[PDB]
Amino acid sequence: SLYKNESGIQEPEHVPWTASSGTAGIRSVVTRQHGIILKVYPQADSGLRTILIEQLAALLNYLLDDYVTQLKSIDKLANEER
Amino acid sequence: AVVKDSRPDQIAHDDKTKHLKAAFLRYCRKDILGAQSMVDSLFSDSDMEPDDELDLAVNQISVDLIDDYPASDPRWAESVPEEAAGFSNTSLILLHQLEDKMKAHSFFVDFLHQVGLFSRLSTCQTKGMLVATRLLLSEHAEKLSAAIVLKNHHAKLPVLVNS
Amino acid sequence: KAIKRDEWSATDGKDDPIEATKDSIFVKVLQNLLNKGIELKGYLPKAETLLQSEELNSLKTNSYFEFSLKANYECYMKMQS
């Protein structure tokens, strides 16, 4: 709300640090963390596994929010391919 | 009732940037009128179409405030490592520095809003990328929030988090 | 003299000035002063006079010593303000 000139203009080319991708990018990191949580899961106790699943679910929720906001920022009039 | 500040001049662009940061200083010292007068002096309408430089100056203000490595007072000149009063594994003090930098960013956004340059802000090239100024402020403040959060986790479980 | 009884990781420390001095007597003096109602910001000398004090300047061979002096005094002084 504070970051609005009039209502703001969505320029689709916009790369927040938390939106950075790659090996050091958030995406590979969260993928590896997902894998590690899964590897722990069979060896984890029941409540341990429960905390694992809620934590991982929240993380994936936030990542999907990131991608969806990216998509809504993107336009297609010339940049449908991006 | 009106006080106008200035800051060290390195370049012409750096000088106008430091004058804006000094208008911010007046804002921090509780002077809306002086900051507004300086903003009027540094920026006035002579046809309004986008230009990179206002965004460049605000962005370099933000980049400095975020990339700052303390050097100002002797403990910060010693934050620059020669510690005898420098950073030596303390949590509350650095939390306070993070608090004051959050104060600075928040007051800078408020200062820009109350002087009215926010609507004149635009999209600027950055590292080759065109970025919205307000979202750039969001990103930098979120980095600062992450630093605060790590500090909080240190304060909560020091040996664990510090190790 | 009260600070002198405290222990320090001498010649560069490895601890938090804030949390490490709690087990020291002088910080306990500070909480007792606060309980009695004394404001540490006003009654505990500013870092200027602290470093003016020679007893305080005779153990500065531990960087961590004087650093922790400054950090703890400022921290609790500001908690008082």
Side-chain angles (χ1 to χ4, degrees):
Chain A
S1 290
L2 301 167
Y3 303 137
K4 292 159 166 156
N5 286 8
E6 304 89 5
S7 177
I9 305 292
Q10 286 294 299
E11 290 270 299
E13 171 57 34
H14 180 67
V15 178
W17 59 291
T18 45
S20 62
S21 180
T23 307
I26 306 300
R27 324 308 201 206
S28 186
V29 182
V30 65
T31 312
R32 190 37 180 170
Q33 176 53 243
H34 172 227
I36 301 299
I37 280 169
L38 294 174
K39 182 57 161 66
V40 172
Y41 198 98
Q43 296 298 109
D45 294 331
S46 294
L48 283 59
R49 278 150 54 174
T50 300
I51 306 195
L52 294 174
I53 184 60
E54 287 103 15
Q55 291 178 132
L56 194 49
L59 294 174
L60 277 296
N61 170 28
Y62 312 147
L63 181 62
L64 300 169
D65 302 348
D66 307 340
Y67 289 166
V68 167
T69 303
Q70 282 173 280
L71 292 151
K72 291 174 298 204
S73 305
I74 307 303
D75 76 345
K76 302 91 192 175
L77 277 296
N79 290 138
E80 157 60 16
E81 181 47 46
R82 66 182 179 180
Chain B
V2 171
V3 176
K4 306 171 70 169
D5 263 9
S6 54
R7 276 198 54 90
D9 174 359
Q10 289 71 245
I11 298 89
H13 187 64
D14 182 78
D15 186 32
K16 65 187 78 170
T17 305
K18 286 264 184 295
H19 294 184
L20 183 60
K21 164 167 195 318
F24 173 73
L25 291 178
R26 290 306 327 136
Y27 167 78
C28 284
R29 314 321 168 215
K30 311 306 302 175
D31 180 13
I32 180 167
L33 300 176
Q36 188 76 276
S37 282
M38 293 182 285
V39 162
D40 295 332
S41 300
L42 293 154
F43 317 98
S44 180
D45 293 350
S46 52
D47 302 357
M48 183 177 177
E49 287 286 293
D51 204 11
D52 194 23
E53 291 297 324
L54 167 62
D55 305 328
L56 201 67
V58 165
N59 169 44
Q60 65 183 177
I61 290 164
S62 312
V63 166
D64 291 331
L65 176 59
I66 64 164
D67 297 350
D68 52 352
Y69 319 99
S72 303
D73 303 334
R75 62 195 57 63
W76 320 114
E78 209 168 17
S79 166
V80 186
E82 69 274 15
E83 175 273 325
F87 279 119
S88 177
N89 177 353
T90 184
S91 187
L92 295 187
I93 310 312
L94 186 46
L95 177 56
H96 307 143
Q97 279 72 247
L98 300 169
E99 169 191 1
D100 308 321
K101 297 174 55 174
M102 183 278 288
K103 277 159 183 288
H105 203 97
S106 307
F107 293 154
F108 185 56
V109 168
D110 302 335
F111 158 73
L112 298 183
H113 271 287
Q114 58 90 12
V115 301
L117 276 166
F118 204 73
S119 51
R120 306 169 60 179
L121 301 190
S122 303
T123 52
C124 67
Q125 173 269 354
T126 304
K127 71 182 186 307
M129 181 265 258
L130 191 73
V131 63
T133 309
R134 62 213 71 82
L135 315 178
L136 187 153
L137 309 160
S138 180
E139 303 158 68
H140 288 347
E142 282 158 68
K143 275 197 295 196
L144 192 153
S145 305
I148 276 169
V149 161
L150 176 52
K151 177 66 50 182
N152 309 338
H153 284 110
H154 281 281
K156 294 185 290 281
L157 292 167
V159 177
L160 311 179
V161 179
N162 71 18
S163 295
Chain C
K1 282 312 212 61
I3 292 164
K4 290 172 178 312
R5 298 277 190 176
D6 308 353
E7 305 87 55
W8 307 90
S9 304
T11 59
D12 305 335
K14 56 96 180 176
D15 298 313
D16 170 13
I18 313 293
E19 82 176 1
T21 50
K22 316 313 208 202
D23 282 5
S24 293
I25 314 306
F26 165 75
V27 164
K28 299 294 187 291
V29 174
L30 306 173
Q31 293 83 18
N32 296 115
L33 294 174
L34 193 52
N35 304 141
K36 186 67 180 293
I38 297 89
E39 301 185 317
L40 308 191
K41 58 160 173 301
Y43 273 73
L44 200 46
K46 59 172 174 185
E48 290 78 355
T49 313
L50 296 176
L51 278 300
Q52 296 301 319
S53 179
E54 178 65 292
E55 285 174 274
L56 186 152
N57 286 19
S58 309
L59 277 296
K60 309 203 292 193
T61 187
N62 177 19
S63 63
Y64 181 60
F65 151 76
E66 53 181 354
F67 151 72
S68 308
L69 166 68
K70 308 175 195 92
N72 305 346
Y73 167 56
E74 289 181 307
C75 167
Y76 317 140
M77 170 267 288
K78 284 309 181 184
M79 301 155 157
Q80 300 297 322
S81 56

mmCIF file of all heavy atoms in Angstrom, chain C residues 44-81:
data_model
loop_
_atom_site.group_PDB
_atom_site.id
_atom_site.type_symbol
_atom_site.label_atom_id
_atom_site.label_comp_id
_atom_site.label_asym_id
_atom_site.label_seq_id
_atom_site.Cartn_x
_atom_site.Cartn_y
_atom_site.Cartn_z
ATOM 1 N N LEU C 44 25.061 5.840 35.873
ATOM 2 C CA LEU C 44 26.258 5.163 35.397
ATOM 3 C C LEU C 44 26.993 6.081 34.427
ATOM 4 O O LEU C 44 26.393 6.525 33.441
ATOM 5 C CB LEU C 44 25.892 3.848 34.722
ATOM 6 C CG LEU C 44 26.995 2.796 34.583
ATOM 7 C CD1 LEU C 44 27.752 2.635 35.891
ATOM 8 C CD2 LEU C 44 26.401 1.466 34.156
ATOM 9 N N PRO C 45 28.267 6.394 34.668
ATOM 10 C CA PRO C 45 28.940 7.434 33.877
ATOM 11 C C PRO C 45 28.976 7.111 32.389
ATOM 12 O O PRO C 45 29.077 5.953 31.981
ATOM 13 C CB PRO C 45 30.353 7.462 34.473
ATOM 14 C CG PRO C 45 30.163 6.979 35.877
ATOM 15 C CD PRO C 45 29.117 5.909 35.768
ATOM 16 N N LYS C 46 28.891 8.165 31.579
ATOM 17 C CA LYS C 46 28.950 8.018 30.134
ATOM 18 C C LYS C 46 30.312 7.473 29.719
ATOM 19 O O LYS C 46 31.303 7.603 30.436
ATOM 20 C CB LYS C 46 28.679 9.358 29.447
ATOM 21 C CG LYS C 46 29.654 10.470 29.811
ATOM 22 C CD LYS C 46 29.433 11.696 28.934
ATOM 23 C CE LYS C 46 30.294 12.865 29.378
ATOM 24 N NZ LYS C 46 29.982 14.097 28.602
ATOM 25 N N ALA C 47 30.345 6.851 28.537
ATOM 26 C CA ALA C 47 31.567 6.197 28.070
ATOM 27 C C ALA C 47 32.745 7.157 28.041
ATOM 28 O O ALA C 47 33.891 6.736 28.236
ATOM 29 C CB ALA C 47 31.341 5.593 26.683
ATOM 30 N N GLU C 48 32.486 8.445 27.806
ATOM 31 C CA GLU C 48 33.534 9.451 27.938
ATOM 32 C C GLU C 48 34.234 9.335 29.286
ATOM 33 O O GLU C 48 35.428 9.027 29.349
ATOM 34 C CB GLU C 48 32.936 10.846 27.765
ATOM 35 C CG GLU C 48 32.479 11.184 26.348
ATOM 36 C CD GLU C 48 31.143 10.559 25.982
ATOM 37 O OE1 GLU C 48 30.596 9.784 26.792
ATOM 38 O OE2 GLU C 48 30.631 10.855 24.882
ATOM 39 N N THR C 49 33.491 9.530 30.375
ATOM 40 C CA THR C 49 34.090 9.461 31.704
ATOM 41 C C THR C 49 34.553 8.050 32.043
ATOM 42 O O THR C 49 35.517 7.882 32.798
ATOM 43 C CB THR C 49 33.092 9.953 32.751
ATOM 44 O OG1 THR C 49 32.505 11.182 32.307
ATOM 45 C CG2 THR C 49 33.790 10.191 34.083
ATOM 46 N N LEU C 50 33.885 7.033 31.503
ATOM 47 C CA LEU C 50 34.345 5.668 31.712
ATOM 48 C C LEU C 50 35.777 5.507 31.231
ATOM 49 O O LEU C 50 36.660 5.091 31.989
ATOM 50 C CB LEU C 50 33.420 4.683 30.991
ATOM 51 C CG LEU C 50 31.965 4.601 31.447
ATOM 52 C CD1 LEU C 50 31.182 3.644 30.564
ATOM 53 C CD2 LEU C 50 31.878 4.177 32.902
ATOM 54 N N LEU C 51 36.039 5.895 29.988
ATOM 55 C CA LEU C 51 37.387 5.793 29.456
ATOM 56 C C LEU C 51 38.305 6.856 30.042
ATOM 57 O O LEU C 51 39.525 6.744 29.913
ATOM 58 C CB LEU C 51 37.365 5.881 27.932
ATOM 59 C CG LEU C 51 37.033 4.566 27.215
ATOM 60 C CD1 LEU C 51 38.058 3.508 27.579
ATOM 61 C CD2 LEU C 51 35.618 4.062 27.492
ATOM 62 N N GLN C 52 37.744 7.887 30.667
ATOM 63 C CA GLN C 52 38.552 8.780 31.481
ATOM 64 C C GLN C 52 39.043 8.115 32.757
ATOM 65 O O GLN C 52 40.125 8.459 33.248
ATOM 66 C CB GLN C 52 37.762 10.040 31.850
ATOM 67 C CG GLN C 52 37.386 10.901 30.667
ATOM 68 C CD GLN C 52 38.591 11.370 29.888
ATOM 69 O OE1 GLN C 52 39.614 11.739 30.462
ATOM 70 N NE2 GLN C 52 38.480 11.348 28.563
ATOM 71 N N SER C 53 38.272 7.179 33.300
ATOM 72 C CA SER C 53 38.637 6.492 34.532
ATOM 73 C C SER C 53 39.854 5.607 34.289
ATOM 74 O O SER C 53 39.873 4.809 33.344
ATOM 75 C CB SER C 53 37.461 5.662 35.044
ATOM 76 O OG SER C 53 37.804 4.968 36.231
ATOM 77 N N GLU C 54 40.868 5.745 35.149
ATOM 78 C CA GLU C 54 42.105 4.987 34.972
ATOM 79 C C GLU C 54 41.949 3.524 35.357
ATOM 80 O O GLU C 54 42.481 2.648 34.667
ATOM 81 C CB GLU C 54 43.235 5.623 35.777
ATOM 82 C CG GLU C 54 44.568 4.881 35.701
ATOM 83 C CD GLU C 54 45.185 4.882 34.309
ATOM 84 O OE1 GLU C 54 44.620 4.247 33.390
ATOM 85 O OE2 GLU C 54 46.241 5.522 34.133
ATOM 86 N N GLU C 55 41.248 3.241 36.459
ATOM 87 C CA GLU C 55 40.982 1.854 36.824
ATOM 88 C C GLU C 55 40.326 1.110 35.672
ATOM 89 O O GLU C 55 40.617 -0.063 35.426
ATOM 90 C CB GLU C 55 40.087 1.792 38.059
ATOM 91 C CG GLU C 55 40.744 2.117 39.381
ATOM 92 C CD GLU C 55 39.733 2.178 40.513
ATOM 93 O OE1 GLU C 55 39.126 3.251 40.714
ATOM 94 O OE2 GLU C 55 39.533 1.151 41.193
ATOM 95 N N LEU C 56 39.439 1.790 34.953
ATOM 96 C CA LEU C 56 38.798 1.258 33.764
ATOM 97 C C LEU C 56 39.738 1.207 32.569
ATOM 98 O O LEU C 56 39.505 0.431 31.639
ATOM 99 C CB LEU C 56 37.570 2.108 33.431
ATOM 100 C CG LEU C 56 36.627 1.701 32.304
ATOM 101 C CD1 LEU C 56 35.252 2.233 32.644
ATOM 102 C CD2 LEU C 56 37.103 2.254 30.964
ATOM 103 N N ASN C 57 40.806 1.997 32.583
ATOM 104 C CA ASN C 57 41.716 2.048 31.451
ATOM 105 C C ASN C 57 42.966 1.214 31.684
ATOM 106 O O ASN C 57 43.838 1.171 30.808
ATOM 107 C CB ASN C 57 42.084 3.497 31.137
ATOM 108 C CG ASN C 57 40.952 4.243 30.470
ATOM 109 O OD1 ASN C 57 39.797 3.828 30.539
ATOM 110 N ND2 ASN C 57 41.276 5.352 29.821
ATOM 111 N N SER C 58 43.067 0.546 32.830
ATOM 112 C CA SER C 58 44.217 -0.279 33.164
ATOM 113 C C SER C 58 44.069 -1.723 32.708
ATOM 114 O O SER C 58 45.059 -2.462 32.699
ATOM 115 C CB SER C 58 44.467 -0.239 34.675
ATOM 116 O OG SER C 58 44.514 1.095 35.147
ATOM 117 N N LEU C 59 42.861 -2.148 32.334
ATOM 118 C CA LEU C 59 42.624 -3.514 31.877
ATOM 119 C C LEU C 59 42.243 -3.569 30.406
ATOM 120 O O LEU C 59 41.886 -4.643 29.905
ATOM 121 C CB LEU C 59 41.538 -4.183 32.728
ATOM 122 C CG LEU C 59 41.939 -4.811 34.071
ATOM 123 C CD1 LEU C 59 42.903 -5.973 33.859
ATOM 124 C CD2 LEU C 59 42.520 -3.792 35.048
ATOM 125 N N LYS C 60 42.318 -2.445 29.699
ATOM 126 C CA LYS C 60 41.964 -2.367 28.288
ATOM 127 C C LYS C 60 42.888 -3.185 27.405
ATOM 128 O O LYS C 60 42.642 -3.279 26.197
ATOM 129 C CB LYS C 60 41.962 -0.905 27.853
ATOM 130 C CG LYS C 60 41.130 -0.045 28.773
ATOM 131 C CD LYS C 60 40.669 1.220 28.105
ATOM 132 C CE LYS C 60 41.836 2.139 27.832
ATOM 133 N NZ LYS C 60 41.375 3.504 27.474
ATOM 134 N N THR C 61 43.932 -3.787 27.977
ATOM 135 C CA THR C 61 44.752 -4.741 27.246
ATOM 136 C C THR C 61 43.937 -5.915 26.727
ATOM 137 O O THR C 61 44.345 -6.556 25.757
ATOM 138 C CB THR C 61 45.893 -5.250 28.131
ATOM 139 O OG1 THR C 61 46.780 -6.060 27.349
ATOM 140 C CG2 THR C 61 45.351 -6.071 29.292
ATOM 141 N N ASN C 62 42.805 -6.208 27.356
ATOM 142 C CA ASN C 62 41.791 -7.065 26.764
ATOM 143 C C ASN C 62 40.890 -6.161 25.939
ATOM 144 O O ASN C 62 40.135 -5.353 26.490
ATOM 145 C CB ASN C 62 40.990 -7.819 27.820
ATOM 146 C CG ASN C 62 39.881 -8.649 27.212
ATOM 147 O OD1 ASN C 62 39.906 -8.959 26.020
ATOM 148 N ND2 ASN C 62 38.894 -9.003 28.019
ATOM 149 N N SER C 63 41.003 -6.279 24.617
ATOM 150 C CA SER C 63 40.084 -5.578 23.731
ATOM 151 C C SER C 63 38.640 -5.859 24.110
ATOM 152 O O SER C 63 37.819 -4.934 24.187
ATOM 153 C CB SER C 63 40.350 -6.012 22.295
ATOM 154 O OG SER C 63 40.090 -7.394 22.123
ATOM 155 N N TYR C 64 38.330 -7.129 24.376
ATOM 156 C CA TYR C 64 36.982 -7.522 24.759
ATOM 157 C C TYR C 64 36.553 -6.851 26.052
ATOM 158 O O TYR C 64 35.380 -6.517 26.212
ATOM 159 C CB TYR C 64 36.908 -9.041 24.905
ATOM 160 C CG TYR C 64 35.537 -9.547 25.271
ATOM 161 C CD1 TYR C 64 34.447 -9.311 24.448
ATOM 162 C CD2 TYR C 64 35.330 -10.255 26.447
ATOM 163 C CE1 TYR C 64 33.188 -9.768 24.779
ATOM 164 C CE2 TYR C 64 34.077 -10.717 26.786
ATOM 165 C CZ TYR C 64 33.011 -10.469 25.950
ATOM 166 O OH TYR C 64 31.763 -10.928 26.290
ATOM 167 N N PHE C 65 37.484 -6.666 26.988
ATOM 168 C CA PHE C 65 37.154 -5.990 28.235
ATOM 169 C C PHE C 65 36.496 -4.642 27.992
ATOM 170 O O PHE C 65 35.349 -4.410 28.394
ATOM 171 C CB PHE C 65 38.417 -5.815 29.074
ATOM 172 C CG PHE C 65 38.378 -4.616 29.959
ATOM 173 C CD1 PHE C 65 37.636 -4.619 31.120
ATOM 174 C CD2 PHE C 65 39.068 -3.471 29.612
ATOM 175 C CE1 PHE C 65 37.589 -3.500 31.920
ATOM 176 C CE2 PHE C 65 39.028 -2.355 30.399
ATOM 177 C CZ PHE C 65 38.290 -2.368 31.560
ATOM 178 N N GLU C 66 37.222 -3.733 27.348
ATOM 179 C CA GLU C 66 36.722 -2.383 27.146
ATOM 180 C C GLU C 66 35.553 -2.374 26.180
ATOM 181 O O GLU C 66 34.588 -1.623 26.368
ATOM 182 C CB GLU C 66 37.868 -1.508 26.657
ATOM 183 C CG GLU C 66 38.549 -2.102 25.448
ATOM 184 C CD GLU C 66 39.698 -1.273 24.961
ATOM 185 O OE1 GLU C 66 39.899 -0.169 25.499
ATOM 186 O OE2 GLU C 66 40.424 -1.735 24.061
ATOM 187 N N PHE C 67 35.620 -3.206 25.142
ATOM 188 C CA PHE C 67 34.480 -3.365 24.256
ATOM 189 C C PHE C 67 33.222 -3.701 25.037
ATOM 190 O O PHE C 67 32.152 -3.139 24.789
ATOM 191 C CB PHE C 67 34.774 -4.464 23.246
ATOM 192 C CG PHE C 67 33.556 -5.170 22.786
ATOM 193 C CD1 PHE C 67 32.652 -4.551 21.946
ATOM 194 C CD2 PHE C 67 33.277 -6.442 23.250
ATOM 195 C CE1 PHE C 67 31.514 -5.208 21.541
ATOM 196 C CE2 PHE C 67 32.145 -7.096 22.855
ATOM 197 C CZ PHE C 67 31.260 -6.484 21.996
ATOM 198 N N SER C 68 33.334 -4.635 25.980
ATOM 199 C CA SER C 68 32.165 -5.113 26.700
ATOM 200 C C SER C 68 31.683 -4.074 27.688
ATOM 201 O O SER C 68 30.473 -3.897 27.874
ATOM 202 C CB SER C 68 32.500 -6.412 27.418
ATOM 203 O OG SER C 68 33.079 -7.339 26.523
ATOM 204 N N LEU C 69 32.619 -3.403 28.358
ATOM 205 C CA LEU C 69 32.293 -2.159 29.038
ATOM 206 C C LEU C 69 31.335 -1.327 28.209
ATOM 207 O O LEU C 69 30.206 -1.039 28.625
ATOM 208 C CB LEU C 69 33.558 -1.354 29.288
ATOM 209 C CG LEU C 69 33.164 0.070 29.680
ATOM 210 C CD1 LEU C 69 32.470 0.159 31.043
ATOM 211 C CD2 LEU C 69 34.303 1.038 29.513
ATOM 212 N N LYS C 70 31.783 -0.935 27.013
ATOM 213 C CA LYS C 70 31.015 -0.003 26.203
ATOM 214 C C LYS C 70 29.665 -0.594 25.832
ATOM 215 O O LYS C 70 28.620 0.051 25.989
ATOM 216 C CB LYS C 70 31.810 0.359 24.954
ATOM 217 C CG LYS C 70 33.212 0.817 25.264
ATOM 218 C CD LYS C 70 34.009 1.039 24.006
ATOM 219 C CE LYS C 70 35.491 1.137 24.310
ATOM 220 N NZ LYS C 70 36.151 -0.193 24.196
ATOM 221 N N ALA C 71 29.669 -1.844 25.362
ATOM 222 C CA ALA C 71 28.446 -2.463 24.870
ATOM 223 C C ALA C 71 27.405 -2.573 25.968
ATOM 224 O O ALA C 71 26.254 -2.152 25.790
ATOM 225 C CB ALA C 71 28.758 -3.840 24.290
ATOM 226 N N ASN C 72 27.790 -3.114 27.121
ATOM 227 C CA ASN C 72 26.834 -3.314 28.198
ATOM 228 C C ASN C 72 26.355 -1.987 28.766
ATOM 229 O O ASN C 72 25.153 -1.800 28.993
ATOM 230 C CB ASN C 72 27.468 -4.187 29.270
ATOM 231 C CG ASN C 72 27.974 -5.475 28.704
ATOM 232 O OD1 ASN C 72 27.631 -5.821 27.579
ATOM 233 N ND2 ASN C 72 28.801 -6.184 29.453
ATOM 234 N N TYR C 73 27.278 -1.046 29.002
ATOM 235 C CA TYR C 73 26.850 0.239 29.538
ATOM 236 C C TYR C 73 25.855 0.908 28.609
ATOM 237 O O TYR C 73 24.795 1.358 29.045
ATOM 238 C CB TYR C 73 28.037 1.168 29.770
ATOM 239 C CG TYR C 73 27.556 2.577 30.018
ATOM 240 C CD1 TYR C 73 26.651 2.850 31.035
ATOM 241 C CD2 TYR C 73 27.951 3.624 29.200
ATOM 242 C CE1 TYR C 73 26.185 4.123 31.255
ATOM 243 C CE2 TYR C 73 27.489 4.905 29.413
ATOM 244 C CZ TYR C 73 26.606 5.148 30.444
ATOM 245 O OH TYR C 73 26.140 6.423 30.665
ATOM 246 N N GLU C 74 26.175 0.981 27.316
ATOM 247 C CA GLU C 74 25.266 1.623 26.379
ATOM 248 C C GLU C 74 23.937 0.889 26.313
ATOM 249 O O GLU C 74 22.876 1.518 26.308
ATOM 250 C CB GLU C 74 25.908 1.699 24.995
ATOM 251 C CG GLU C 74 27.054 2.693 24.900
ATOM 252 C CD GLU C 74 27.655 2.757 23.508
ATOM 253 O OE1 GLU C 74 28.027 1.693 22.972
ATOM 254 O OE2 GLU C 74 27.751 3.870 22.949
ATOM 255 N N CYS C 75 23.978 -0.445 26.289
ATOM 256 C CA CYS C 75 22.758 -1.229 26.170
ATOM 257 C C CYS C 75 21.822 -0.970 27.340
ATOM 258 O O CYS C 75 20.640 -0.658 27.153
ATOM 259 C CB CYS C 75 23.117 -2.712 26.088
ATOM 260 S SG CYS C 75 21.738 -3.826 26.301
ATOM 261 N N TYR C 76 22.334 -1.074 28.558
ATOM 262 C CA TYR C 76 21.455 -0.928 29.709
ATOM 263 C C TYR C 76 21.116 0.531 29.966
ATOM 264 O O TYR C 76 20.004 0.836 30.404
ATOM 265 C CB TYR C 76 22.092 -1.584 30.930
ATOM 266 C CG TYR C 76 22.704 -2.925 30.597
ATOM 267 C CD1 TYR C 76 23.917 -3.307 31.141
ATOM 268 C CD2 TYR C 76 22.060 -3.819 29.745
ATOM 269 C CE1 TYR C 76 24.483 -4.524 30.838
ATOM 270 C CE2 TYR C 76 22.623 -5.038 29.433
ATOM 271 C CZ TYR C 76 23.836 -5.384 29.985
ATOM 272 O OH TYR C 76 24.408 -6.599 29.697
ATOM 273 N N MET C 77 22.045 1.442 29.673
ATOM 274 C CA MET C 77 21.752 2.867 29.679
ATOM 275 C C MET C 77 20.568 3.188 28.783
ATOM 276 O O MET C 77 19.654 3.923 29.178
ATOM 277 C CB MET C 77 23.007 3.617 29.224
ATOM 278 C CG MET C 77 22.840 5.089 28.949
ATOM 279 S SD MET C 77 22.485 5.438 27.224
ATOM 280 C CE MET C 77 24.076 5.103 26.482
ATOM 281 N N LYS C 78 20.555 2.633 27.573
ATOM 282 C CA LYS C 78 19.449 2.891 26.666
ATOM 283 C C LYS C 78 18.176 2.187 27.110
ATOM 284 O O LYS C 78 17.085 2.747 26.955
ATOM 285 C CB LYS C 78 19.838 2.490 25.246
ATOM 286 C CG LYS C 78 20.768 3.496 24.588
ATOM 287 C CD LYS C 78 20.199 4.904 24.712
ATOM 288 C CE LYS C 78 21.084 5.937 24.035
ATOM 289 N NZ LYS C 78 20.576 7.318 24.254
ATOM 290 N N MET C 79 18.280 0.975 27.667
ATOM 291 C CA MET C 79 17.102 0.383 28.291
ATOM 292 C C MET C 79 16.536 1.269 29.389
ATOM 293 O O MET C 79 15.323 1.259 29.618
ATOM 294 C CB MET C 79 17.398 -1.004 28.869
ATOM 295 C CG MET C 79 17.890 -2.040 27.880
ATOM 296 S SD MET C 79 18.848 -3.324 28.698
ATOM 297 C CE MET C 79 18.680 -4.658 27.515
ATOM 298 N N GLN C 80 17.388 2.028 30.070
ATOM 299 C CA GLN C 80 16.909 2.998 31.042
ATOM 300 C C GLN C 80 16.266 4.211 30.389
ATOM 301 O O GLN C 80 15.241 4.696 30.881
ATOM 302 C CB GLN C 80 18.057 3.458 31.938
ATOM 303 C CG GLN C 80 18.692 2.333 32.709
ATOM 304 C CD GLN C 80 17.729 1.674 33.670
ATOM 305 O OE1 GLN C 80 16.904 2.339 34.295
ATOM 306 N NE2 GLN C 80 17.827 0.356 33.791
ATOM 307 N N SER C 81 16.830 4.708 29.295
ATOM 308 C CA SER C 81 16.264 5.877 28.625
ATOM 309 C C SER C 81 14.927 5.554 27.972
ATOM 310 O O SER C 81 14.286 6.426 27.390
ATOM 311 C CB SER C 81 17.236 6.427 27.582
ATOM 312 O OG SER C 81 17.607 5.430 26.654
#
